[PDB]
Paper text:
Arl1 is an Arf-like (Arl) GTP-binding protein that interacts with the guanine nucleotide exchange factor Gea2 to recruit the golgin Imh1 to the Golgi. Here we report high-resolution cryo-EM structures of the full-length Gea2 and the Arl1–Gea2 complex. Interestingly, Gea2 is predominantly composed of α-helical repeats, with six domains arranged almost linearly from N- to C-terminus, except for the catalytic Sec7 domain that rides above the HUS domain. Gea2 is a highly elongated and crescent-shaped molecule, and two Gea2 molecules dimerize via the DCB and HUS domains to perhaps confer stability and structural rigidity.
We expressed the S. cerevisiae Gea2 with an N-terminal 6xHis-tag in E. coli and purified the protein with a Co-NTA affinity column followed by size exclusion chromatography. We employed mass photometry to reveal that Gea2 predominantly exists as a dimer in vitro. We determined the cryo-EM structure of the Gea2 dimer at an overall resolution of 3.7 Å. The three HDS domains (HDS-1, HDS-2, and HDS-3) were partially mobile and had weaker densities in the consensus refined EM map. We next performed masked local refinement, resulting in improved EM densities in these regions. We found the structure of Gea2 alone is almost identical to Gea2 in complex with Arl1. Gea2 dimerization is primarily driven by hydrophobic interactions at the core DCB region involving Phe-171, Leu-167 and Val-209. Beyond the hydrophobic dimer interface core and at the edges of the dimer interface, electrostatic interaction dominates at the N-terminus of the DCB domain. Indeed, the homodimer of Gea2 is globally asymmetric due to the conformational difference between the two arms of HDS domains. Interestingly, the Gea2 heel-like motif is highly dynamic in solution; it is invisible in the Gea2 alone structure and becomes visible only in the Arl1–Gea2 complex.
Author numbering:
A (entry chain A): 175 to 259, 321 to 440, 454 to 874, 887 to 990, 1004 to 1064
B (entry chain B): 7 to 30, 70 to 259
Write the structure that this text describes.
Amino acid sequence: SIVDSPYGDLLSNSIIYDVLQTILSLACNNRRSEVLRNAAQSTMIAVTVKIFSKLKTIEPVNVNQIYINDESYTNDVLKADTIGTAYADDNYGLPVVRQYLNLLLSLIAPENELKHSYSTRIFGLELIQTALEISGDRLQLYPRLFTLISDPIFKSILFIIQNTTKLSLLQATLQLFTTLVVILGNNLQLQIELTLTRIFSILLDKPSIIKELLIEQISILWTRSPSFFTSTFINFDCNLDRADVSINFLKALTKLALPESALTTTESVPPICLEGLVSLVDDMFDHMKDIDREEFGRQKNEMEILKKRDRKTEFIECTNAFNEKPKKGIPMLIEKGFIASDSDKDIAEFLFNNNNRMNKKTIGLLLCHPDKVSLLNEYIRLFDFSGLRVDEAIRILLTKFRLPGESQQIERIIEAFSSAYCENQDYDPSKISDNAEDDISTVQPDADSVFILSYSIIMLNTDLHNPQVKEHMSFEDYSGNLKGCCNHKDFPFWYLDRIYCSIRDKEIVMPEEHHGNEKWFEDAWNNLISSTTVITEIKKDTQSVMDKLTPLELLNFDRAIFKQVGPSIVSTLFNIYVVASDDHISTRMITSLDKCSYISAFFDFKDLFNDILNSIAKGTTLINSSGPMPLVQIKFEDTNTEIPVSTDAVRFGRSFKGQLNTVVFFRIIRRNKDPKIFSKELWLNIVNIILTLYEDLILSPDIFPDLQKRLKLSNLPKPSPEISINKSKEGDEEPTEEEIKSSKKAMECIKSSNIAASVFGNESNITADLIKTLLDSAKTEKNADNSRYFE
Amino acid sequence: VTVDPVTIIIKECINLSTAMRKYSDPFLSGFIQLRLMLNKLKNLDNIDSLTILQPFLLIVSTSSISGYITSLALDSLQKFFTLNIINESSQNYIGAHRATVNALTHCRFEGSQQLSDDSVLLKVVFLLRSIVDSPYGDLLSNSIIYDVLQTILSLACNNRRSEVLRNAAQSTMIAVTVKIFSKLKTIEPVNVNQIYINDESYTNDVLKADTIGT
């Protein structure tokens, strides 16, 4: 009651932190109660809602500044329940929300698995999910909370996904992951790539229940994320130095859609995969609302992003060559379009940009060379420091470098760092002594001064973050060691205090941490955190790259992804349509096939379009190439009609899939706008289906009667029937009432298929090929089996 | 707010559907239908909130379901409320909230031992307090709020329950009384000239027995 009131909002950070501690201790302590625990959980949920709502109305601080991650992640611990039996003294703000997020992380920490129960971890994940769903982008604006979400919370999420079996923790973890990807997906690209790769790996090889839950949550991911698979394609497949997340995702979905994949997997997965594929097709179709395909054809240039995306395989080959040996890799990179020129500026730019798919230790070993020492001077000139209190400069330098073991190369690295630090910061003669806590106008060492300070910093890190070294290093000893420093003077007390504390409660992050096993997950996440979340420069972009793309380029990306993943999708769609048995699933499948035909016709994919149409024709089971039931024409004694009872008649009347595919096929033919899209097999199939539908059933030879009336010729001779009877019941007993009504149903379907306007009158289907095939498919022989209609 | 509430709705729908499937028919069908309808959507406009809440309210009101399922349903309802999924900018929000409160009032279930019953009843009472003490609860109806008073007071006075549940019911009753008379402070007074005669009967309303539960 207090917290959810203005009086609560006028409290202090320490008080509200103690409130959080006590309420959460009551909520997540066994042996207390159940009703009391639920009340405490609801109270904690409400308090979190209020806290982050208050966070929503606080302006950001230092928007233009660059943040160097230095705060520790193990400063808050949930103290044991004992109730019964800026700075503090302010009015809330960022300190309380930061400490609350830190405590929540301590709840779900991957190194605290043995110290907390599963209900506590699920509750912590739920609290984090509520906080995210309340704050979102406004939370993304602030740097420390975004760091605590990027590195450690997502590390915990990935660890839980990889190494859990309770499935109740897994459900909460997957829900939080989906919430993160939906809300703050555009700023957590690397984490999403890693998590999705792990999920695909686990899903393609543990009980089936885990895979079912994984696929269900990831399914709820793609439906609601705006225009999925194409944002993923753009951000990952076309960005290089990453993995083809979208293409691999679609390939795994196609591999998991067949019933052969329904085996040794939960049977509810295949419908989910089919929904995903249908969603991709529908998204592509919706992207073609009003595009005027002529305009698409008029386009000449291709997006340079796609051009580089087509060059990715040779990029991987060049990267492997570079990792093997730089003296051979560099000529290979400069031969192709990756490296602009042999100028060291371009080489430094490349070595700075793509520090994700380049062996960092190999980079360090290469860069120690003399010519590579000149390259190193240019490369560190490429950096940007603007102060950073020396230690943050060291962190920046070591983010994308593995220091070689030998001391000579370390000396070269540190001296180049000193020179670049001097160059990138213009010192001033102020040089204020104590009683000056800032670093811009005050601390101003020299080249050898910062050299000594940086060597001391490295020594302090390697001495204070190794458990195998007895004792530690104190502030007094370190300060005494750094006597005889800048300007032959000593550093200020505040400066050394800050440096010592910063290197104390944070280990310097370095890439290529280990090589082996038993720490593979820690190594992977270290090579992730080394890239981001140590530097968080907010670009304040309006949205993801999706919105800043013109509709033509969006359609181009759709065309590329379809070119990659089309044949597989259409193959699995036809497979499941053949297997399918239910009415609704078959109708949805054939609608998806119709949309696929439309999309193939839009992008002028002749092979795919003819493949899908020919598959429809062969599934029609009406144009097969390679017992005999004579056809019977039915005329009543009243209300004269025509009911031809033939083999194909009953075969069609007892084929739901047959009629569905016929009507869809002729609808597709109706929609067509180009004649030079079909194939010879396609034209043969359509001419044959129309001919066999003319032999019997309902295709009257009244097509284009205007010409017949022009020459005053009579109606065409109707093909004779094999066994024609006239009924007086309104004998030899050939027809049956149910087969009669089945033939009537087939007649109704065929007359509803509007064949005449579908095939002939479309102003485009009338081309040389159609009439040429019509003439070639003629008959010139007088056998009895065909004399019934030969003339 | 600004957090695409349709995503929260679909998450709760898939959660409840998965729970029912694991525990194991019209309720699951309604959840699936709502799932599809919301999936083919982009915001919450042009669709009445009563349709969104109807499966959840129906699964709350039904008597022959397990306590775990209705507990999950009530948790989903409270998450819907606390995130303001249904607001003043939604169709039939008056009807939606009135239906939610009506379904809560006549809640029933069956299942496990007294601890689970106490937990689900506590969730019910918390949701009723959260909704009445809010503006939306102020925009309820006379009969609905009278029924809320009847149910909460009956639960409080019943001696066959636990102690914590009775304390929670007492606290909620005090809060609801405070809210009712605080609203009474704002109503424009009735005729101050005509003389009133106390012909209205003094005893017609008798507290009913507890009905929510097994």
